[PDB]
Every structure is written in C-alpha cells, then in structure tokens.
Structure 1
C-alpha cells in the first residue's frame, strides 16, 4: 500500500504477510458472509491496484464468485472509459483507463505515480469501490434465506429470532432505512403468536430495545 513516512511523504510499502494471511483466512472461514466486506475494506487500506489484485488472486476457492467479480470490474471499467476517454509526452503522467485502474494494464510505478500525484488520482480507492460493488452482488447471491422465511419458532427465544432476522436482512442487503422500518412491520408479523400478542400491545413507535425487553 501507500503510507506516510516521517518527512511526511507518501511512499509505497510492501503488503505485509499479516495482511495477506488475514484476508486468506477470512475468506476460508467466512466465505461471503456480509461482514467479509468491511474486513476486506479495512485490510486493503491504502492499497494500490496491485495490492487489491494480490488479495483477490490469493483466494484459492470460490472461483465462481471471483469470475463474477471480474465481470463486475470489467463493467465498471467500461463505464469509466465511456466517461473518461484517454488519448504521449516524454516523462509525463498519462491518464489511467479502466484496465489501468484495475491494475491489469498499469505498472506498480504508474499506480504509485497516480496515487501520489498532486492532486492525487486515487486509482486504488476507485478500484476498491468497483470490487466492493462486485462483492456485495456475491454476498446477495450467496445469501441462503429470504427474509420472508425467517419466522420465530414456537419456543425460539425472541432474541435468537431477531438475530436470525437481521442477519438475513443484512445478507439480502436491504437499505439501512428498511432495516429501521421492518422493526414495526415484518419483525412483528413473523414473530410467534405469544410474542406477537405482546408486541401488538406495545403500540406504535416501539424501539427494538423495547420489543426485545417485552418478549424477554
């Protein structure tokens, strides 16, 4: 990645063995559970396009997902090229094309040049945005359950049902507003008869905390 040294300068630093192993192990253990995306984003802080490709390429399994990710990257690259056409002056910085942002046709030195320019052309952040769009699509595709099928069991603690409900909603990746709206609507409808009766009596505008206390 590109980090700050002590004369305040932005310099390249090798991706660390700790970072590499952390990402490989997170994919092995969590596959494409939603929390893998924020872990990817944190582990790739300051990454060049080369670093991002390294992280993705070091994944051994899940090649269906990785092929879908390549399709998404290429689509985002194509839209980049449409909005930002390109074309060389001796010793001058050229403009990155989509494939340069994705690190396929650009060199590490070109990537460092763009990222450390004034003003910086943040090819790492742009590429990471495309990758996260792709991973989100994979997370949704690999979501095992529809929120419509998350219903509280007759003897299931309300807390465990709510955990399942919002876990599913996260993989299904509804908005943060919908997740705030299902509290008074779908969460109540999918509760079991005993808790539903209690939740109905709480009235409108009950917080999640109040609902969970009531059915505790």
Structure 2
C-alpha cells in the first residue's frame, strides 16, 4: 500500500503477512457472505491495484465466482476505456500519461507508475475506481450466490 511516512510524505510499504492471512481466513470462513464487502473495504485501505490483483490471485477455491469477477473487472475496464477516450496529440515531457482500464486493473501499469498517479498533484483515485468494480462484481456474486 501507499502510506504516509513520519517525515510527512506518501511512500509505498508492503502489506503485512497476518493482514494477508486475515484476508485468506475471511474468505475461508464467510465465503460469499455480505460481511466480506466492508471487511474487504477496511483491509483495502490505501491499497494499490497491484495489491488488489495479489489479493484476487491468492484466492483458492470458488473458481466459478473468481472467473465471474474477472470477467466483470474486464467489462468495467472496457467501459472505462469507452467512457474516457485517449487524449489529444502526443504525451507532454512535463507530464505523465493518462491511465486506461488495464492501468486501473494494474495490468499495464508498473508500481512506480501507480505511485506517480496517486501521489502526484492532483492525484487520481485508481484504487477507488477498481474498488467500485470489485464491490459491483461482489454484488453480482452475492445476488447469484443467494439460494
């Protein structure tokens, strides 16, 4: 995640193993139950896309759901690209590039790039955009997996 250091700057720090394991354990115990979404939300505080793929990729089991989510993440990403067209002409030397759906999904962007966008002024909340897609896709799952 990207956290604020004592000095008063935003720097990246790694997520903790008993945080990781707590994510694992939630999924083990409460599967598709709604409490998973606030839980997720708390444990995703200050998290990167990269950390969010890590959390999704580290799941075991419920592979039908994991595929449905993936496909929702790509749909929501396809929709990001649709709604926000690429911008006019070449990229400025003085500036950094606008993200695509796949940069938001973490796929085409690097960590330093993910830190550029979030730490820069104005900052862009690429975590929160992926977060809604995850929560939206979580609703899809919850609604389906209701019996």
Short-chain TM bin: over 0.9
**SS at the partner of 2:3?**
strand
Structure 2 distance, partners of 1:143, 1:116, is 40
Question: Could you report, residue by residue, the CA deviation over 1:132-156 in whole angstroms, capped at 9, with x for unpaired residues?
Answer: 1101110111112xxxxxxxxxxxx
Select 2:133's aligned residue among 130, 146, 157. 130
TM-score, structure 2 normalization: 0.93
Question: Could you report, residue by residue, the CA deviation over 1:87-119 in whole angstroms, capped at 9, with x for unpaired residues?
Answer: 534473111000100111111111111111111
| Structure 2 unaligned blocks of 5 or more | none
Question: Could you report, residue by residue, the CA deviation over 1:157-213 in whole angstroms, capped at 9, with x for unpaired residues?
Answer: xxxxxxxxxxxxxxxxxxxxxxxxxxxxxxxxxxxxxxxxxxxxxxxxxxxxxxxxx
Question: Could you report, residue by residue, the CA deviation over 1:34-54 in whole angstroms, capped at 9, with x for unpaired residues?
Answer: 111111111111100001111
Residues 42 and 75 (structure 1), Cα distance of their counterparts in 2 relative to 1, 3 Å cut: same
Structure 2 distance, partners of 1:47, 1:76, is 19
4+ long deviations beyond 3 Å: 87-92
| Structure 1 unaligned blocks of 5 or more | 145-216
RMSD: 1.2
Structure 1 distance, partners of 2:35, 2:58, is 19
**SS at the partner of 2:121?**
coil
Displacement of 1:10 in angstroms is 1.0
Structure 1 distance, partners of 2:95, 2:16, is 31
Matched, 1:17 2:17: yes
Partner in structure 2 of residue 99 of structure 1: 102
Displacement of 1:85 in angstroms is 1.5
TM-score, structure 1 normalization: 0.64
Bigger Rg, structure 1 or 2: 1
Aligned pairs (5 A) from 1:49-88: 49-87=49-87, 88=91
Structure 1 distance, partners of 2:119, 2:18, is 25
Question: Could you report, residue by residue, the CA deviation over 1:20-67 in whole angstroms, capped at 9, with x for unpaired residues?
Answer: 111111101110111111111111111000011111111011111111
Name the count of aligned residue pairs: 144
